[PDB]
Amino acid sequence: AKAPIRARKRVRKQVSDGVAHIHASFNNTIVTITDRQGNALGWATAGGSGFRGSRKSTPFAAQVAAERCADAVKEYGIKNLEVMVKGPGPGRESTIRALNAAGFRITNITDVTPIPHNGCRPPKKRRV
Amino acid sequence: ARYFRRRKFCRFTAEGVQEIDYKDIATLKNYITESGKIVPSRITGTRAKYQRQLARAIKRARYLSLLPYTDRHQ
Amino acid sequence: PVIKVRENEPFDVALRRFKRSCEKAGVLAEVRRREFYEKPTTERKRAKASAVKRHAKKLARENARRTRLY
Amino acid sequence: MRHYEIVFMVHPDQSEQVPGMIERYTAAITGAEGKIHRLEDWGRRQLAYPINKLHKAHYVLMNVEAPQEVIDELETTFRFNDAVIRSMVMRTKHAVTEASPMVKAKDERRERRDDFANETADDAEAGDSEEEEEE
Numbered sequence: 001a002k003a004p005i006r007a008r009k010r011v012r013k014q015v016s017d018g019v020a021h022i023h024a025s026f027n028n029t030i031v032t033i034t035d036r037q038g039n040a041l042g043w044a045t046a047g048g049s050g051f052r053g054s055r056k057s058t059p060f061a062a063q064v065a066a067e068r069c070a071d072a073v074k075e076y077g078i079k080n081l082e083v084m085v086k087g088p089g090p091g092r093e094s095t096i097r098a099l100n101a102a103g104f105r106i107t108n109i110t111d112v113t114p115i116p117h118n119g120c121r122p123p124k125k126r127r128v
Numbered sequence: 129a130r131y132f133r134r135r136k137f138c139r140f141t142a143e144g145v146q147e148i149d150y151k152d153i154a155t156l157k158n159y160i161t162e163s164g165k166i167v168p169s170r171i172t173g174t175r176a177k178y179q180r181q182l183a184r185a186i187k188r189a190r191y192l193s194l195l196p197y198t199d200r201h202q
Numbered sequence: 203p204v205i206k207v208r209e210n211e212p213f214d215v216a217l218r219r220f221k222r223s224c225e226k227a228g229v230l231a232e233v234r235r236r237e238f239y240e241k242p243t244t245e246r247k248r249a250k251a252s253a254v255k256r257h258a259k260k261l262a263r264e265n266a267r268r269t270r271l272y
Numbered sequence: 273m274r275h276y277e278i279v280f281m282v283h284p285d286q287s288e289q290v291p292g293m294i295e296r297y298t299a300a301i302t303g304a305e306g307k308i309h310r311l312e313d314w315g316r317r318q319l320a321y322p323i324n325k326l327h328k329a330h331y332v333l334m335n336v337e338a339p340q341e342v343i344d345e346l347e348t349t350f351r352f353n354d355a356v357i358r359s360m361v362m363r364t365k366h367a368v369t370e371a372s373p374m375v376k377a378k379d380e381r382r383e384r385r386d387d388f389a390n391e392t393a394d395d396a397e398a399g400d401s402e403e404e405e406e407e
Contacts, residue, residue, distance in 0.1 A: 093204070096204075100213065109211060115198060118232070
């Protein structure tokens with residue numbers, strides 16, 4: 001043994017593959033990478049990037065949530081994603097564009113918003 | 129000449145008078161999307177009386193847990 | 203938000219045209235409003251109604267264009 | 273008499289123990305000068321809520337001519353049974369004249385209209401024989 005390297009030569013898992021789940025919400029966007037069985041490995045957000053409701057709800061805040069979430073899972077040795085998205089928010093493709101641009105390989109993008117057979121009475125915003 | 133090439137439940141009076149039935153859930157699959165929605169008369173290849181009758185049977189099978197009703201299940 | 207796709211990571215193709223769940227989507231018709239027997243066709247005739255100078259200018263362009271007398 | 277149709281359900285563990293039920297129901301209808309025109313299996317179907325702490329169950333379909341009071345009586349038998357866990361019965365209905373009609377609907381069940389928790393092979397020991405050269 002020599003003295004150790006200046007930047008790591010090695011990484012403790014190499015599971016290769018996962019799913020980026022995005023909840024692009026009406027006030028925010030939340031990005032979490034999870035292993036293929038849905039146990040979450042790391043996450044990051046719009047709102048934690050110095051933004052309130054009024055700015056965290058934008059595709060630009062969401063774009064940054066994707067980068068902090070790509071960094072969140074770096075040690076689990078994932079690089080391959082597919083993508084799942086829910087919620088009315090605009091964090092749905094600018095997020096993905098910056099997700100892929102933070103060193104991951106996307107292959108599929110699929111919606112997982114639950115839609116009803118009529119269902120129950122909706123929540124109200126602006127008394128609508 | 130006589131006769132000409134008919135359309136589904138067309139050129140006759142005594143077909144599709146009573147409802148198009150639900151037990152053929154394999155045939156019903158033809159008349160739903162990949163999100164479990166109904167397709168209208170112009171898409172089932174049928175006219176107004178028969179589409180109303182299709183849409184009752186399609187409804188029936190899905191709420192009987194026999195036909196797809198969304199892209200998702202649990 | 204994203205629908206489902208045969209596509210290779212679409213995010214650089216500016217699609218919005220079908221890419222919703224509620225946002226300009228068909229399920230917005232019973233979400234968050236009353237039943238309105240009249241409204242949904244009334245609100246078309248009303249939306250169209252005020253821009254009449256710009257309307258009439260295209261009509262006049264087309265009548266002057268159509269006759270082959272110039 | 274009337275042409276009738278019968279649906280009933282059992283657990284997944286009981287999807288190859290349903291022909292023993294269909295024997296008795298057949299014998300009620302044949303006992304009544306009625307006849308079995310078709311016998312069919314819709315297979316395992318997924319449930320929005322667990323019955324007796326399990327998320328899936330098994331559907332079967334019979335198609336008959338019977339006196340209407342037999343099928344009144346049989347709709348009540350399912351509704352008094354705890355092994356038969358839900359039914360529907362419907363008036364004025366008949367079988368197909370087709371052999372193996374149900375295989376194409378078994379195919380639809382296993383593909384998009386379950387959550388496929390249980391093997392195809394035990395649920396197929398119910399109903400209509402999957403004679404794939406007839407259908």
